[model samples]
Target: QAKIFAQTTKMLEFAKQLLETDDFSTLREAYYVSKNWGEARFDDQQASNNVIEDLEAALGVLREHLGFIPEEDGSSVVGPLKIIEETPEGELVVDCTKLGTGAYNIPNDVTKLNLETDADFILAIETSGMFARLNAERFWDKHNCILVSLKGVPARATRRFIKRLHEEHDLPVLVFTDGDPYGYLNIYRTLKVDKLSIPAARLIGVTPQDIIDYDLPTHPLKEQDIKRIKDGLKNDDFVRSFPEWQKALKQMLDMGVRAEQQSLAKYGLKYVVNTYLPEKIKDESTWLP
Candidate 1:
């Protein structure tokens, strides 16, 4: 009890100092800084992160407002949007179209950033490699949309970025992920709110039906995948709520196989950018609720 009190007090003090100075520290940085607390110091970054979350809950403030930022950079965006970032030096405007072969990296704290775009919709990809492929093809330019790489299950900031874009610009958000349990339950599930709240969020493809329609390459579902699929069907309220999702997950289980976003490459590298996506985008019937 004493140790908990000590740690909480020290963290509050640190938060206070950061607010007073208008400074910020990453979660990792805060963990290392706790070494100064001696006995109150955290043994690992997770422990420190938990305490930070606890403080956030107790104070009724976000971690960002508490001057805490995530260590990871979050997602990457490529395409028509313009980000006006407020830096310590000055305000910087970045046009996503001018990045050449590169993409704009979404920062850990996006609350202060402003977005400008006339894109028709937002396409959130599951993998960086897939994101790179689409970006290389300038797919966003052709589609007149934005491409965001979720890098697996997106970081909080990445979710926030997508949410902000959809809310402010009134753009539809479509998610394309692997046809696996993890992609469905973890990544897309987290993103559905961006869909649910905005009411325009949709799961674009790589569904169980896509596996058959595209005849894509495949991998056997792992032990964990089977478990997650079973568990989700039995226990997850979200899975229960959507009959389409339930049917998809059941099909995946019956087929005993899974496929990645890159699996569409069996046709050709550009097949995803040129053909599959184009077909999928036009067919709203293929999208999951």
Candidate 2:
């Protein structure tokens, strides 16, 4: 049996059944959507009426019908990706958290949601630059995303973005940021915090190679002991973050790259989204480098 992913990246079987099968609920969600195949047309649902004959056709219909699915639409959420269960009515919720928070990287999540949701367009409180985020938003501009971070944000408001990502987009969110140990830890702690956040907030990850590692002699910097920063080095707080980082820095000596997040951003999506995202996802088939 072949499989189909609703939009969650999870696979659902789409193969032929036996001549005499006892149960048929497995394909009920597909059936439900198929019934209203063209009611919403754009959300044509998956018309898997003849799976054995046309699995691809079946899958395509499922994506179209479900993707453009709306909150008020009455249908089963039993496909590849489902935010709710049994409830035919579904709603879209917007989150407002950032990368540091667990489960959701606000920017990435919104982009993914917009793409997968197939909505006409959506808005965000943050700006998205990395190509993946941009692509997700653009690819589904119909169900698109908008970033609002150009205006600057309060420190506490960042979590709102994160919370919305997980609660709405049910998938792992990838965060792109500087690779310094301190910056790394700040992001790590941001996700791990159990404080006000969505239940699935811990599902997010980052691109390992995106970490530009501490070159030179930079140490972690704690805001409180900001004065300890030496003439050229960041403070000891950095060294203590992730012992591996300290070791890597110790070995690299002063060879560390003298670049911060802004400097790295100069590389733009070439590195931020294209090169590193495919690498982290282990998608050897993609070629950006």
lDDT of 1 at 155: 87
Q: Rate the local accuracy (lDDT) of all candidates.
A: 0.89, 0.31
Off by more than 4 A, model 1: 1-6, 38-44, 87-90, 193-200
* Clashing pairs counted in every model: 0, 33
Candidate 1 Cα RMSD (Å): 2.7
Worst 10 residues of 1 by lDDT: 192-201
Instruction: List model 1 lDDT by residue over 1-289, tens digit each.
Output: 7887899899889989998997889999999999999999998998899998888887778788888988877688989999997887988999999998888889988867889999999999999999999999999999999999999988888887898999999989999999889898988888874222334579988899999999989999999999999999999988998899899999999999999999888899999999999999998999987
- TM of each candidate vs. truth: 0.88, 0.33
Q: 21, model 2: CA deviation in Å?
A: 55
Off by over 4 Å in 2: 1-154, 167-169, 197-255, 261-271, 283-289
Best by lDDT: 1
lDDT score of model 2? 0.31
